[PDB]
Amino acid sequence: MYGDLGNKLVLEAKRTKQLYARSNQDVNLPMYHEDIIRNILKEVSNLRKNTEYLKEQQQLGMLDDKVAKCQYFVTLLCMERNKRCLLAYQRLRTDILDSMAWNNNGLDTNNLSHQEQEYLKEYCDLITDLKSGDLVDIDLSGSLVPPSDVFIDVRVLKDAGEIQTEYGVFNLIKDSQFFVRQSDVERLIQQGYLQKI
Amino acid sequence: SVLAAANPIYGRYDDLKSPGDNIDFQTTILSRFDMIFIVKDDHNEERDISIANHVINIHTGNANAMQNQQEENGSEISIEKMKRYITYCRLKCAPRLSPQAAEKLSSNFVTIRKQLLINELESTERSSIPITIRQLEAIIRITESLAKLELSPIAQERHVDEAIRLFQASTMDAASQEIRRFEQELKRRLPIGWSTSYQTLRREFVDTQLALDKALYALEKHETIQLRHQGQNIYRSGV
Amino acid sequence: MDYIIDVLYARKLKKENIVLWWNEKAPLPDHGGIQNDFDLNTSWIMNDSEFPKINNSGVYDNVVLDVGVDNLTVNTILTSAEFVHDAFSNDALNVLRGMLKEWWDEALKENSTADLLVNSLASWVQNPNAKLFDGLLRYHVHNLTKKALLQLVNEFSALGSTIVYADRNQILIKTNKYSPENCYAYSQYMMKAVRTNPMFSYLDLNIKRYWDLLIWMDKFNFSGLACTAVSQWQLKKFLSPIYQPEFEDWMMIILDSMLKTKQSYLKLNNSLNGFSHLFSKPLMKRVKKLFKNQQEFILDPQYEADYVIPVLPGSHLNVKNPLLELVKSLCHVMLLSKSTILEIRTLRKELLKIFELREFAKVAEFKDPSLSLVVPDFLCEYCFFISDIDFCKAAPESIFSCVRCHKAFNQVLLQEHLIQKLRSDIESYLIQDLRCSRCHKVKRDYMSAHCPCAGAWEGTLPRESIVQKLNVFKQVAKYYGFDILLSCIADLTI
Amino acid sequence: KIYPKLHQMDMDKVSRVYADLRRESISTGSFPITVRHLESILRIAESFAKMRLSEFVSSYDLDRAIKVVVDSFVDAQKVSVRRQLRRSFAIYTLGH
Amino acid sequence: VLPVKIQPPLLRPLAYRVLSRKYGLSIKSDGLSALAEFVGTNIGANWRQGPATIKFLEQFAAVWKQQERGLFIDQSGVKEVIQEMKERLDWRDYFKVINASQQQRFSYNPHKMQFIFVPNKKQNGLGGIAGFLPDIEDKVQMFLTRYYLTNDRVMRNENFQMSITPIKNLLGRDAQNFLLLGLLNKNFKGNWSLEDPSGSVEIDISQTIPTQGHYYVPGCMVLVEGIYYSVGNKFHVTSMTLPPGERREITLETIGNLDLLGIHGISNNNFIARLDKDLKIRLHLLEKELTDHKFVILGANLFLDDLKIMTALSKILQKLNDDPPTLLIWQGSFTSVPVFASMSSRNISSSTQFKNNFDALATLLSRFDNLTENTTMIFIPGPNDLWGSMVSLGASGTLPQDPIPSAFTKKINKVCKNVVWSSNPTRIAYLSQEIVIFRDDLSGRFKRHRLEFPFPQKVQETRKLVKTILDQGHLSPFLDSLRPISWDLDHTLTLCPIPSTMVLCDTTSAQFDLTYNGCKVINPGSFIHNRRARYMEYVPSSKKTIQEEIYI
Ligand SMILES: [Zn+2]
Ligand SMILES: [Zn+2]
């Protein structure tokens, strides 16, 4: 029956929601269900053909004030349901992509639809437009854990050689350790090169 | 689950003897096994050399370090973690078959049933190793278990391919196991180093009629014939 | 002369009412349009040539007859004698038989032209430029030649002898006799008894050498006394230069000891029993001294050039200890003696002890240092001699000139045959059948992913073997400086 | 008290011994060589090292073990083949 | 620009405050020195002198986002920013030739219903010798890819979305109507048969009615309707047809508009290149703008070792030197005999003779200045060319045939300004037109092997040819046991997004310039025929095809 593929798709939605919600990291979101979506869209096209057939046959006039009213209303509701299921799935994966944008890309691509890939590009362009405009003195893409300590120990987890910072350098020797201003290394903690606190 | 280990009658499998003479078990109890493996000493010298090097590496104590390296490399997991993982898979997941998996399994069932039928005709007796609708459920359970490893809530085409492959590798391989005039006719009429295209041999033998493929299987096991070119050319390769 | 044979065959064919497969425009026979299409049988027919040449390595204290053979192909065509789809047309074959008999009778009546013609037939049955060339005819003649050589070996062995080696030009035969002077009569009896069988009526059976004592592992690696001693070893060529004279010295010492033992045993009356005892202790003392010297000098720039291992055609493998390579070579040559395996084996153990290598250690095992690259059925037109030539195991003089006569082979002709062999093997790789990897059934269908017995499909020519073939081709091309072949090899990758 | 270790093992020799024993054991009625016999060579070599109270198995122990197992195999064969088989196996055992 | 007034320790805070603080890009020291001298060699004055400093650093950072060269700066990366600044349309940037061996390989995934990129492992470096050789796995996947592409193309056609049942579904479904899609086998037992990835079935054609616009050779993918009968395990065929071809636009838009050529960009395993719509339109407008460009195609079987050929050709090239082509396709068997290993040393050897012919040809090209410096030569081998001839002896052989070897090109390569010795299924990627070229004499093979069913001519037997080729979607419909394919390179013979034009050259059929599904297929069948030299002028900016002849 016409609601079923929508239910399969939103059960998929719920499972990917749980997959994302169980962990602190961004779990790489699962494959876009192109096949179920195409089955739904074909089902919607069939329901559209049924409305077309019926609105043709209202010229022929069979009991239309009730019977055609009922057939039309039911198939219309089937289409509303299928729209709701499709938009619920797409809105969840949109929400997760927005989260990933702010977490990393605004500072696994095969699993997205091409609309979702170019959407993620445009949304990263938007985040960068915000932190590049007014309010620029705040790195709007930065962390939301409050700054507890200004100086921190950090252990170098992967090697990256000599890099400059605002008034000096760090030579990121493997398994060396710094005592350093947190604001001068936060980018490297996010990028996974530095370990502690 | 029942995991059982047994030797054939006569202890060693005795390959030239009929399987119905080698196998003690009745077809009733045999049918209750999803997979029946018939295990044989291949006696291949390269294999035996390999096994010898391996077993020496066991007894020397090299293998104690090798297993630890394999576990830390992530190519192997330990008893403890695997025990917990089997428990977790048995409690989280219990997958269904997709419709596509179901059709492939159904057609595979009729295929293996046809193979057993023609083998029972060729050997003019009911087979000791059976294929029954219970054994379709064996392939179903194996499909589901293969999906149950990765906690996939449904089994898919790939899992069915592996389940079919395992059943073919085990129970079918257990089941799988006047011509004297026709073989010497072929030896007379196809001399060394030349090719008879198969269909012409079929027409000639029919024109004299299933003895053909027995003759080809025998002569192909021997060095005398080689089925070249997609099986189209019967090539008198050997003596 | 192939063209004269073409027209003269065309006459007798049309006179026997055969439709004529003369082709003017292309080498392939004009069968109508079908000749233009690839076919697995046709491609097998064109690609295939190798004789199943027999090589029973060993030591032979019996006298060995080095029987040359010639006119083998002519003999098969004369003495020879739808369901079969790569047999040449039996009508055309009967015409070629009767016509060859006619030419041969006129050669026996000393027609220089008919004699020259029958000599040149071996070219025409192979030459693609022959107007009546047919790959089926070439193959029919070739596999009949193969069967005839096997029957000739059957005939000699049926007369109580035993074959050391056999190919399309040569047979070496163990006699079950011990003295050459005793056997100059029996050998001629034996050869006459073969030729008087009708199957071999036309053969040029010729006793080219008498070997009193023979050490043999292949025709490029043998030594013996002839009735006087000769030694030739492709083995030797891979030892570093300090050790090549050392190898020849100990080979002469081995021959001397074997001969002393043979003549001793015969004065006292498989005769080789105990031959190791005449030189084993000197050899061990020598090897110990050489091992000390190698430790002194292998690293030394004064001497290292004599320890550097030679790069060569078909140079199979890397080696770490060149003295060990000499010892492996000597021990392998001596281990050819089936009668005396134990005494050699114990000596080999006592030698490898110098290196502290264990008796069966994988390093101490002898693998042949040379990889064969045989171009089958090369033609010396100057004397119509058909020979397989091995660009690695043969010496350079035997590559750039004929062995029987000594006219030089043309360089570009030679390189063209190597490129033809190379492309034949690449095609044979791409046109191969696949075989099931655990039950050896052939893949008959076109779109299965695996065999019904659950076995994965694998090649009948595994890719590794063809990688190895291209490697020896690049080695041969670099060594002899074959610019055309080397640029062909370059154009494969690039 | 004594638990001899294998060391410096002539892996290629035991491998060739087992491979040849397996090949010649294809004779349908012969003593059925199996992987537990390969492990038996090692048990016997260890027992010989035990007799010496030696915590390492020497080459002499292993060679005596090979001699026992090969002779036990050869001795079980019918006279029609026993000379040929003993001659063939002699390279592994009469070197000791 | 003024002399440099910068040092990296002084410029360091500003470089950080832009690249790191805004965008997270890390200031590795060597890249900082290169960045500092780049800034100094453009600004000159010291970093403190106005917003141009931060504007320049911002421009660097934006170009860094364009080149995506990682989380740390480096001197090579600064050089990339410089080159992208030098880039801050010319048709030569887009016209290129793709040999069979240089084409981006794509495998077709059936489950994902889309293409995926595969690296050409000649790139891997370990393929320095025997990199070119396929793997056995390629052989088992060869026909599967053809089927999956055909099946996917079928499902997109409106007539089917009755529907295909895979052949394995038939077994036991006795006495019932089905539609199949399958590879037309002849079983080893001799019977005609169809095969599918799921299995195969023997067929009876004795009551069938094929559709008439097609050839039906073995190995052709055929849609088949019939009744399955389990009693003989037969499938009795009602009717048979080739699966409908798909127009180029429909294929491209429904596969996701990939660049399968590198006409816009090269692909990686992490990055499938996209055929950008705006650039496609810009190129299309330029393509319509270039009224004057003309591709000249010579006929096949241009034997350089016949004086009559060379005389005719001298006359033709003398015409072309008056007004040079944009491009000039030579093709097909440049020697009368196939050139194979000689049997004798008396005559000048076969290989040497072939070399002499390209010397003679280079002598001709020397006389024609405008041609030699304004055209692009393309050479396309045929059955008589050099390394294929070695093993085939002039028959058909391993089909994605290699270009004629570089040991024999040398004098030609010296005299000509531009040449491409290309594979037999070569491709030209013109501005928007993918143009396949193929030299095969197909029509003889089709008529020689077509299935003979129980139960004007020159136009009909070429409509049949192109409809067969394009509905089959693949230049070699025949089984590999009748035309072997290099297993790795079978993707080059596939036409799945149907080309914009095809020079389907064939010496055993009439000349033509048909159109089918928007694909313009032309055939300048033979160079010397009926005492005329024959050549053909395809005009890309209008798709006209003016045939031309010289009497001789
Ligand atoms: Zn000669
Ligand atoms: Zn198999």
Secondary structure in 3-state letters for C279-299: CHHHHHHHHHHHHHHHHHHCC
The two tokens of residue C95 are 């015409």
Q: Which of E214, E242, E270 is the last residue of a domain?
A: E242
Rg (CA), chain E: 28
- CA–centroid distance, residue C380 to ligand 1 (Å): 5
Q: Quick one: which of A35, B162, B100 has its CA closest to E165?
A: B100
Is residue C438 a contact partner of residue B170, using CB atoms and an 8 Å limit? no
Q: In chain B, which residues have their Cβ closer than 8 Å to the Cβ of C444?
A: 230-231
Strand bridging mode E209-210 / E234-241: parallel
Residue E49 is assigned to a structural domain of this protein: no
What are the b/e assignments for C55-85, b being 16+ CB within 10 Å? eebebbbbbbbbbebbbbbbbbbbbbeeebe
Q: How many domains does chain E have?
A: 2
Contact B171, B138 (CB under 8 A): yes
**Same-domain pairing of E447 and E313:** yes
Residue E107 lies in a domain: yes
Q: Are C449 and E147 inside 8 Å of each other by CB? A: no
E286 and E352 assigned to the same domain: yes
CA distance A71 to A63: 11
Strand partners, E528: E533
CA atoms of D54 and B166, how far apart (whole Å): 49
Domain boundary among E182, E217, E242: E242
Residues C58, C50: Cα–Cα separation, whole Å: 23
In the three-class reduction of DSSP (H, G, I as helix; E, B as strand; rest coil), residue D91 is classed as helix
CA–chain centroid gap for A82, Å, is: 21
Q: Which ligand gives the minimal distance to the CA of C403?
A: 1
Nearest to E381 by CA among E505, E488, E229, E492: E505
Token pair 């060396």: residue: A176
Helix C2-15 to helix C112-124 angle (10° resolution) is: 90
The Cα B162–Cα C247 span in angstroms is 58
Determine how many CB atoms are found less than 10 A away from the CB of residue B89.
15
d(CA E532, CA E523): 16
Query: Rounded to whole angstroms, how far apart are CA atoms B39 and E428?
Result: 58
Rg (Cα) of chain D, in Å, rounded?
14
Contact indicator for B136, B109 with CB cutoff of 8 Å: yes
The C-alpha atoms of residue E213 and residue E193 are separated, in whole angstroms, by: 21
- Decide if E34 is inside a domain: no
Report CA Rg, chain A.
26
Q: Which ligand is nearest to the CA of C444?
A: 2
CB contact under 8 A, B43 and D18: no
CB contact under 8 A, B61 and D9: no
For the residues of C227-272, what is the DSSP string, one character each?
Answer: --EEEEEHHHHTS-TTTHHHHHHHHHHHHHHHHHHHHHHHHT--TT
> Distances from the Cα of E411 to the Cαs of E329, E354, E355, E388, E423, in angstroms?
18, 12, 9, 21, 20
Query: Considering only CA atoms, which of C66, C54, C334 is closest in space to residue C225?
Result: C66
Locate tokens 């020879």: which residue? C80
| DSSP letters for chain B | ------PPTTSS--TTS-HHHH--S-HHHHHT-S----------HHHHHHHHHHHHHHHTTHHHHHHHHHHHTTS---HHHHHHHHHHHHHH--PEEPHHHHHHHHHHHHHHHHHHHHHHHHTTS--SS---HHHHHHHHHHHHHHHHHTT-SEE-HHHHHHHHHHHIIIIIHHHT--HHHHHHHHHHHS-TT-EEEHHHHHHHHHT--THHHHHHHHHHHSSS-EEETTTTEEE----
Which residue bears the tokens 């030698």?
A: C351
CA dist C346 → D87, D89, D94, E82 (Å): 14, 14, 9, 75
Length of chain E: 552
Token representation of residue C97? 């038989």
CB E453 within 8 A of CB E210: yes
3-state secondary structure at position C215: strand
**CB pair distance less than 8 Å for D6 and B60:** yes
Q: What does the alpha-carbon distance between residue C21 and residue C34 come to, in Å, rounded to a whole number?
A: 12
- What is the separation of C-alpha E489 from the centre of its chain, rounded to a whole number of angstroms? 11
Distances (CA, A) of C215 to B60, C224, C367: 42, 6, 18
Which of E216, E242, E268 terminates a domain? The answer is E242
Q: Is E470:E495 a contact under the CB 8 Å cutoff?
A: yes
> Whole-angstrom Cα distance, residue E473 to residue E465?
12
Report the first-to-last Cα separation within chain E, whole angstroms.
68
**Touch criterion met for A and E (3+ Cβ pairs within 8 Å):** yes
Round to whole Å and give the CA distance between E510 and C485. Answer: 40
Are E513 and E462 in contact, with CB atoms under 8 Å apart?
A: no
CB E477 within 8 A of CB E217: yes
Has residue E11 been placed in a domain? no
Instruction: Measure the CA–CA gap between A111 and E318, rounded to whole angstroms.
Output: 59
Q: Are residues E330 and E347 in the same domain?
A: yes
Whether E110 contacts C470, CB under 8 Å: no
Give the DSSP per-residue string, C45-106.
HHH------EE--EEE-S-EEEEE--SHHHHHHHH-----SSSPPHHHHHHHHHHHHHHHHH
Which residue, chain included where needed, has tokens 């171009």? C375
Could you write out the DSSP letters of every residue in C366-401? ---SB---EEEEEEETTTTEEEEEETTTS-HHHHHB
What's the number of CA atoms in the CB half-sphere (13 Å) around residue B214?
A: 16
Q: Helix, strand, or coil here: C20?
A: coil
Task: Give dist(CA C417, CA E378) in Å, integer.
Answer: 29
Sign of CA dihedral C413, C416, C418, C420: negative
Q: Is E528 helix (H, G, I), strand (E, B) or coil?
A: strand
Q: Of E218, E238, E240, E191, which Cα lies nearest the Cα of E450?
A: E218
Tell the residue number behind the tokens 């090369």, with chain if given: C378
C383 is in an annotated binding site: yes
Say if residue E464 is in the same domain as residue E532: yes
**Residue from A48, A103, A115, A102 nearest A80 by CA:** A48
Going by the DSSP 8-state scheme, the letter that residue E415 receives in this structure is: H
HSE-CB for C113 with a 13 A CA cutoff: 4
What's the Cα-to-Cα distance from C105 to each of B3, C16, E138, rounded to whole Å?
81, 21, 57
- Domain assignment present for residue E348? The answer is yes
* Residue-wise burial string across E169-192, b where 16 or more C-beta atoms lie within 10 A, e elsewhere: bbbeeeeeebbbbbbbbbbbeeeb
Q: How many CB pairs under 8 A join C and E?
A: 176
Instruction: Assess whether E252 and E302 both reside in one domain.
Output: yes
Pairing of strands E192-196, E199-204: antiparallel
> Does one domain contain both E288 and E150?
yes
Alpha-carbon distance C6 to C129, whole Å? Answer: 10
Residue B133's alpha-carbon distances to B36, B138, B140, D31, in angstroms, are: 16, 9, 11, 42
| Amino acid at site C160 | G
Burial of B169 by CB count in 10 Å (0-12 exposed, 13-18 middle, 19+ buried)? middle
* Whole-number Å distance between alpha carbons of E537 and E552: 19
- Under a CB-based contact definition with an 8 Å cutoff, are residues C458 and C440 in contact? no
Query: Do E269 and E286 have their domain in common?
Result: yes
Residue E220 belongs to a domain: yes
- C-alpha closest to that of E235 among E178, E190, E197: E178
Residue C165 CA to residue C58 CA, distance in Å, equals: 11
Residue E213 belongs to domain spanning: 162-242
The radius of gyration of chain C from alpha carbons, rounded to an integer in Å, stands at: 26
Which H helix or E strand runs over E277?
Answer: helix E277-289
* Run of H or E residues at E106: strand E105-109
Whether E236 and E256 share a structural domain: no
Phi then psi for E195, rounded to 5 degrees?
Answer: -135, 145
- Closest by alpha carbon to C213, among C273, C150, C263, C268? C263
What is the 8-class DSSP label of residue C10?
H
- Pairing status of strand E295-298 against strand E327-331: parallel
Residue type, position E149, single letter: L
Residues whose CB is less than 8 angstroms from the CB of residue C464 and which lie 6 or more positions away in sequence, other chains included: none
Provide the 3-class DSSP secondary structure of residue E294: coil
Pairwise CA distance, residues E388 & E333, whole Å: 11
Is C380 one of the annotated binding-site residues?
yes
CA distances from E250 to C243, E106, E372 (A): 74, 19, 40
**Token pair in block for residue C38:** 């690839």
Residue E255 lies in a domain: yes
DSSP character for E194? E
Q: What distances in angstroms separate CA E365 from CA C54, E315, E317, E413, one per listed residue?
A: 56, 12, 8, 11
User: Does the residue E35 lie in any domain?
Assistant: no
- Tokens 């695996």 belong to C450
CB C308 within 8 A of CB C374: no
CA-to-CA distance for E331 and E526, rounded, in angstroms? 10
User: Would you say A143 and A120 are in contact if contact means Cβ atoms under 8 Å apart?
Assistant: no
Q: Find, among E231, E173, C451, C447, the residue nearest to B176 by Cα.
A: C451
Q: What is the number of the ligand closest to the CA of C442?
A: 2
Q: How many CB atoms lie within 10 A of CB C461?
A: 16
Q: In terms of domains, do E485 and E372 share one?
A: yes
Strands (E), chain A: 151-155, 161-165, 168-172, 177-181
Q: In this structure, are E111 and E172 located in the same domain?
A: no
Query: Both tokens of residue E92?
Result: 């030569």
Task: Quote the tokens at residue A159.
Answer: 């090697």
The backbone torsions φ and ψ at residue E19, rounded to the nearest 5 degrees and listed phi first, read -65, -45
- DSSP class of residue E150? H
Q: Please state, in angstroms and rounded to a whole number, the distance separating the CA atoms of residues C174 and C187.
A: 11
Contacting chains of C (3 CB pairs or more, <8 Å) are: B, D, E
- Which of B166, B173, B230 has its CB closest to that of C444? B230
Non-local (6+) Cβ contacts of A81 within 8 A are A2, A3, A6
Residue B57 burial (CB count, 10 A) = 16
Instruction: Look up residue E312 and give its two tokens.
Output: 């005719």
Specify whether E443 is located in the same domain as E501. Answer: yes
Q: Which of B109, B110, B216 to mutate to test the interface with E (most CBs of E within 10 A)?
A: B110
- For chain D, which chains pass the contact test of at least 3 CB pairs under 8 Å? B, C
Residues E288 and E373 in one domain: yes
Cα–Cα–Cα angle for A65, A67, A73, nearest 5°? 90
DSSP per position, A95-112? HHHHHHIIIIIT--GGGS
Chains D and E touch (3+ CB pairs under 8 A): no
**CA distances to B116, C323, E501 from E432, in Å:** 58, 68, 11
Q: Which residues contact C317 (CB under 8 A, 6 or more apart)?
A: C367, C369
CA distances for E146 relative to C277, C339, E475, E531, E550, angstroms: 71, 62, 11, 42, 42
- Angle at the Cα of C73 (from C70 to C78), degrees rounded to 5? 115
